[PDB]
Amino acid sequence: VLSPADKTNVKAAWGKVGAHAGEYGAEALERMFLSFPTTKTYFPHFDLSHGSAQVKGHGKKVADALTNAVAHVDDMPNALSALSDLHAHKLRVDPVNFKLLSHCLLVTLAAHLPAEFTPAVHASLDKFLASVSTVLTSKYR
Amino acid sequence: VLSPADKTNVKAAWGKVGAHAGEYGAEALERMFLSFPTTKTYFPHFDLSHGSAQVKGHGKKVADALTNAVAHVDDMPNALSALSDLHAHKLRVDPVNFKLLSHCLLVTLAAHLPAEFTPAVHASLDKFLASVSTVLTSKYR
Amino acid sequence: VHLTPEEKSAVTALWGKVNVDEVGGEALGRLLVVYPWTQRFFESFGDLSTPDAVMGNPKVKAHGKKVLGAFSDGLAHLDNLKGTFATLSELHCDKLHVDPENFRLLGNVLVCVLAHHFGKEFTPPVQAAYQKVVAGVANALAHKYH
Amino acid sequence: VHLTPEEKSAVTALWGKVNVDEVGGEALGRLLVVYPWTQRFFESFGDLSTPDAVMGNPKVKAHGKKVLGAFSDGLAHLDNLKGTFATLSELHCDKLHVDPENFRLLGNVLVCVLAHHFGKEFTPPVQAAYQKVVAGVANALAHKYH
Ligand code: HEM
């Protein structure tokens, strides 16, 4: 469960990210595709060329969902309900890949938040991203 | 989440296990130690060889916890609360190992219950075992 | 992934009794029932709407034959699984776009199917040998991803 | 494993800029903060009661530096990680009883620590090369388990 301290940490860190969220979402996707090439098996329909607008657009969608999850941190199952339906019934990404994207999101945050990415904030962000992932895979079967 | 059919399936299969619950728990543990030697790191103080009184006793504990979970299938987070406290604060087994034991429990059940281990029942049991594992790792951080 | 001589013997002994066609269909069917998101790769196979629709689906069963045929062939080359599965690895990556995590899932489902068919004969040591095999096959099928 | 010549060069260049005291203490400290159950292996280190206590703990800092020392040996022998880490693998299994899944956790914390220090310099390609490295180290450290 996300503690009050976790929620404070996540809200502060994502607040600092602010309007950079979409850019960071794209960067996290690019990091994931390069670092964990098996994740590209979910995007054979994408243009994956360097600086791909399609990847950037996707990064924005991922980031905006995360922004929403932060805004609704007390009730993520409800806030993410439509998205979790889509993941379970259409996208059907194997659960292991959520940990890969989550790690790449942490790396991206670490690379952009030198002051903010303390050990405690790192821990809270990791819990938050794992919780989002749990919600997104909750209806798989 | 476990569906009405999942709960029917788990109750029927585990009920058929019946008096064999402890035997099958110990067999699952043995299968795990042989198949996945890294799981032995958690039992340096055990004789892990075949016929081990320690493995037999532990198998009985594991099986009895599963029987209690089946009895309280709609309230597993609370029925397993003390056990989840022990896991989070003492045992501290990495979550991957729960998947290994769960798989070994499915293999044991398959090997003993030809008629009962149908594809639908197999699916329900896997979900049930994953749900128990989730409860047992829920308080780690 | 290195099997002992006795494990190799046990694997080969058990496999001689396997109906590889039947077992392949059953393993692939159970994959699609137990982990239903894996149906994403088989939309063309028709009705996958219930456990029976999946298990008895003739296209699932026919495909399971291919899969287990290739697995069976790999059992003859336990010391060179990466080489054995290289062209299939490239195919599953470049043409089929299959996340290799699926190979790990299928291997464990296959182990369950072997236990179901063989009962007590699928002893803990025999399982341990087969777990080395399915881990090696999954790792081999993943190896040429890029 | 499979670092390309250009990734080998990139890994070596970045590592030549790494402060081992800082990066080692931060990586081990963050393992213990982010995944607090791993503290089970480090009770003798004394006070691990808060993140500040962990990060400032002299034994955590010293041990993190030692761990990075072994990592440096790996980076100097990328074509034989298994041989490089054989003795340490045996130690971690036989004497320390450390589940190798923990090696993956440490590898990814190390990557986060490199990103945190280097910022934009820790580019996506550089990260990809380091992911191969940490995966290779974890796999080598796991290799002599039995
Ligand atoms: C033991 C592991 C596996 C083996 C040995 C194996 C082997 C094969 C073989 C021999 C083919 C035929 C290749 C061709 O068409 O040229 C094939 C096709 C295919 N496999 Fe795999 N496979 C394995 C696991 C999986 C898994 C787990 C999945 C996904 C859940 C998968 C998805 C596919 C798909 C989608 C095709 C093409 C099906 C079609 O023609 O519509 N495979 N596989």
Ligand code: HEM
């Ligand atoms: C994956 C990269 C790792 C490397 C390269 C590494 C390396 C080392 C080295 C060089 C030592 C000192 C060995 C000696 O005493 O001669 C050591 C000790 C130790 N390591 Fe590892 N390690 C790694 C990961 C881990 C992890 C993830 C854990 C636990 C979560 C762990 C637990 C320990 C423990 C408990 C000791 C003994 C500490 C003591 O003296 O009390 N190691 N390691």
Ligand code: HNI
């Ligand atoms: C490695 C694969 C993968 C992972 C782990 C993943 C993890 C996540 C996470 C977790 C933090 C979030 C918040 C997220 C959010 C989104 N993803 Ni993800 N996605 C992934 C692969 C996809 C794919 C594929 C699509 C479809 C994209 C397209 O345009 O076809 C997708 C679609 C989306 C959409 C658009 C839905 C819609 O059309 O309404 C959102 C929002 N997502 N994805």
Ligand code: HNI
């Ligand atoms: C691979 C490691 C491992 C896994 C995956 C695991 C998975 C599970 C699962 C999951 C289905 C269940 C229901 C379960 C139940 C139990 N475990 Ni587990 N345990 C594990 C390693 C332990 C260890 C270690 C102990 C202590 C044993 C001893 O006697 O020292 C333990 C002790 C217990 C006990 C006894 C607690 C007490 O003393 O009150 C129960 C009951 N368990 N364990």
